[PDB]
Subunit: 140 residues, 5 copies
């Protein structure tokens, strides 16, 4: 299977490398394609292109919204864009958004975004290969 | 015959899917049921559309229990919009079953409320499938 | 000509009956089709299905949104759905949303819902038959 | 040749259409002009799109006058999205001529403002249709429709 | 790739297009450029889409400057979704270059900020067109357009 991973230069933490590593751990021969875009608002088309043009069965969308009110609106815009990209291709995009807000300092933020990217990576795996497991875990 | 798709999450703290399936099978024992579980509420829109367009579901139920934070309301509002888009792209209903965290006073109430709501929306799904004119009798009022 | 009328069970006034009465008043041989959905979020697809599958020329979406901030967010999602539904099918849907916000007490609420269903039903008649009366009334006078 | 759709409302407190039409016809005596009136702002988008796709309109003016209330502002935002989606689904412009009641003090000013906004937007229509490169001369020039230009 | 569209407005108070154009030609001298100017920020989405679909642009820069009021804030949000929707309908990037007036403390800063953000985004286009593996090198780093890089 093919997974697309779309990250940004805006993000203050590399989430991609740990997503990749988690995916390869769980399914050694799984195919990965990486695309990097400037900002969170560039994520929806890049994800869609990857789903429609590069054969990706699923995509992970990696972003890190800033602290401001304007950044919360940006992320909301991008969130909706991802939802539309998904409805246009009957394919999943797991939105991996870690707000800077969510950590108390840089060291915590680095750890948090990477742990979130790993966890969503696990989910991508389960959605691809073990979608009976997610049912077993239905709500706690 | 009729097919209902049921999409829920791992994140939610009540299993509403079981509540609704059971309700559905008692009112009409020959309804077909396909289930799909997604990590979170924002993954509900595609999964519902997929079940509608690819698995021949006549209708879908989308189940989730949003959190209480101001950022949970946005995610839920995000998801609800996807659900509405998914429906207009397929001329098929999706019944949204979102039970927010603040809608009950504690955990014990939240579990009971979510149970009640999942059952009630399953009733509505039944009416929409088999007696549409029974919703009209209680229209408005 | 054919009008679709979509209401809810959740609503607290029968607006549908009032719209239908006015409509058959102004045009005795207008064909009417009704569909009742549980809630406001279920309105847009019902409206779109009527427009596209039932040969409705125009549709009236009728609902009675609550007072809560949650009810307002829901109503807003509903209105966007109705707006997208109209663009995908080059057909009008006339929104008759009456928020509990707009009246004091139920007495006035009941009356205002009724009056709105009527005046909008008239607008529907005009769009269908006398679109040049609306032009006369553009910018109020 | 060259056709303009003008869509307005009965809800509006001021007639903006007559200004826009008069401006268009003085800018281009031969332009074809199509009018349609709807009850309200939420009715604008489908009316606009129908005008573009069914009546062969090259461009449309959507004229709207939202009320003062926060509920009105929500609907205005809903119409605005609608207008924007209509344009995308039919690669044609719709010029949003929305005048809020918040924008003026008194009715005399509301009357003045809405009419001047409609007129300046009518000229922009002339420009998109016949002389788009003029708008390029005016890139970054702080131009305002209604109230006076901000400037660079 | 060969073709870039640049869409700006008359509303904006700083000419953002010239600096982006200059950057583009500096990095890739033979690059094709096409410009359209619209009145406002809400007119950006369709102009952008037509350039992608009817003028054969590989990518577009959408340049605008939202005003200060909580109503220009809504206009830009509306305009941003439009931009995203235009991108998803085509499978083509539109780089949004919005400089809100609230971000600068006077006009001198705003001229500076808008020009810088435009230039850096123009550099981002270059990479997206020609060197997209470099953006992967800068994945998760401090990168900002206009204001100084935040750092990892």
């Amino acid at each position: 299977k093919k997974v697309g991973i779309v990250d940004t230069t805006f993000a203050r933490v590399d989430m991609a490398s740990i997503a990749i590593k988690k995916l390869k751990e769980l399914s050694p021969n799984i195919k990965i394609i990486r695309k990097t875009v400037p900002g969170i608002k560039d994520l929806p088309v890049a994800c869609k292109k990857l789903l429609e043009e590069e054969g990706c069965d699923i995509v992970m969308a990696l972003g890190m919204p800033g602290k401001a009110e304007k950044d919360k609106v940006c992320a909301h815009e991008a969130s909706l864009g991802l939802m539309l990209a998904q409805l246009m291709t009957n394919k999943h995009i797991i939105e991996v958004f870690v707000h800077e807000d969510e950590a108390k300092d840089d060291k915590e933020l680095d750890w948090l975004a990477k742990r979130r990217a790993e966890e969503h990576a696990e989910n991508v795996y389960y959605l691809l290969f073990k979608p009976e497991y997610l049912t077993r875990m239905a709500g706690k």
